[PDB]
Amino acid sequence: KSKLPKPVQDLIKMIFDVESMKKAMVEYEIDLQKMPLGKLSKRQIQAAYSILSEVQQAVSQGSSDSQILDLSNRFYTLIPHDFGMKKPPLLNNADSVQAKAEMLDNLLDIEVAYSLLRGGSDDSSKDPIDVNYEKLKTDIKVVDRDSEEAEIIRKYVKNTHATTHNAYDLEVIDIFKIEREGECQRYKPFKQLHNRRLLWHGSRTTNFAGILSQGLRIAPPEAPVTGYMFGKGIYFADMVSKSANYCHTSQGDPIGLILLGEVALGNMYELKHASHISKLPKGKHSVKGLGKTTPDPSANISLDGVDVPLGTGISSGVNDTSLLYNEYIVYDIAQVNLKYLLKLKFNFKT
Ligand SMILES: CNC(=O)c1ccc(N2CCN(Cc3ccc4nc(C)c(=O)[nH]c4c3F)CC2)c(F)n1
Known part of the structure; x- marks a missing residue:
């Protein structure tokens, strides 16, 4: 055993x-x-x-x-x-x-x-x-409940759950520190880039064997670029509940999994509406979908030199946008370094 x-x-x-x-x-x-x-x-x-x-x-x-x-x-x-x-x-x-x-x-x-x-x-x-x-081919370790990283992670979950996603609450069961083989070396050209943020990526439990072995991946070239709001990239959120909606849990399966990844955003291409793009314009490293709501920018904390937007939801100031919340899209798989995996219990109010 x-x-x-x-x-x-x-x-x-x-x-x-x-x-x-x-x-x-x-x-x-x-x-x-x-x-x-x-x-x-x-x-x-x-x-x-x-x-x-x-x-x-x-x-x-x-x-x-x-x-x-x-x-x-x-x-x-x-x-x-x-x-x-x-x-x-x-x-x-x-x-x-x-x-x-x-x-x-x-x-x-x-x-x-x-x-x-x-x-x-x-x-x-x-x-x-x-x-x-x-x-x-991933080193998976359990994060100690009383550690500083665990406290920061629990505050991110606690503070970035949106009011419009209140049909459920979130309870952190386990925190895993994850290290995919080869990923750290792949990430090196982007390791000191500006705009490096610790962001959420929720997925179904059935995706995580693929995610841990192959990493977060972009849809293949055969895929219709119009089938995705900002084209074919890797999508992340700064609101835990926005990503936890991608877990597709229910009363009959309330246990979900969510990632925390360090994303090298660099120069963000800011958009309010769908833009089915194949390649970013010259000088841009990511797309930022501008939401009406944003975690408070003055409440940003640092965990291993990476910006952690754990502030509570406030108005961004952005008008006539098709998004309630921000989203971040990278079009190169190397721009993602997976840091944590959380097991969450969804407590439905319905
Ligand atoms: C060669 N390519 C592959 O082998 C391959 C393998 C898996 C792929 N998918 C699995 C479904 N997934 C769904 C999805 C989408 C958007 C999300 N946006 C946020 C904020 C979030 O938090 N979660 C999200 C989210 F889960 C996307 C990636 C893929 F595209 N390609």
Whole structure:
């Protein structure tokens, strides 16, 4: 049996759960008989993205529902759905392409998780928790409850939960200090860049085996750039509740996972509305989606020379913006250095 700390053991079990991976596929209405977890491949996912891009071209160029029908069916051919003998819903709008682009992104992390678990060696004498921990190539340590870093992290959670996200409260169960193999060396050209912030990135439990082994990744080139508000980058938030909404927890599964990453923002390209960009303008290193609300800038604290925006939510002064809260997007995977992973219990008020 494993010598790993009990919170680390429970984390590994959580993220390598096969039935959670299956429950996530069922949520997307995928036919598991026509295509199980083991049939999932990058090749198929990329072909599905490419057809979604063709659907996107047909919708933006204003094709008829009779004309797009052919392209909508082509997607359902690559990613089988569970509708029985009924006709699938027509993908004739941007919301539909956005929803399908989002599902595919998630399937890309699920495929990594299942590949990791089904790859490798079988040894009965070794605890499967120890076996599955090594697959991640990440040093995972438990942060001491009474430490300074734990106090700062708990204040960030406590102070940046938005009023509009009050249908639930957050309880920090565990704090993990994480170190992905090779990530620190990848980050080096951006290590002393200006505008380095410790930001949130929430995701489903089924994404975290992929996130810890491959890191936060940008949607592939086949993916429709219009399926994402600020194009194809890595999205972060300064409001814990904005990111915790990406955990997709419920009364039937109230345990979520959220990251704290050091993001080299550099010169921010400030936007109030959707801009489906492929490349940043010269001199810019990130995109900042300007929210109506911002954590109080005079309340910013420093944790290992990185700015921590743990202030309470105040008005930014920004008018006529499409965002309630800020968002930060980087278009180079090297600009992210994962620092912490938090296990949270969501206490629903509904
Ligand atoms: C070659 N590419 C890959 O292998 C690959 C693997 C996974 C990918 N996804 C998984 C779904 N995820 C969803 C998502 C989106 C936005 C979020 N914005 C905030 C503030 C937050 O807090 N969370 C968010 C969020 F979770 C995005 C990244 C991906 F795009 N690509």
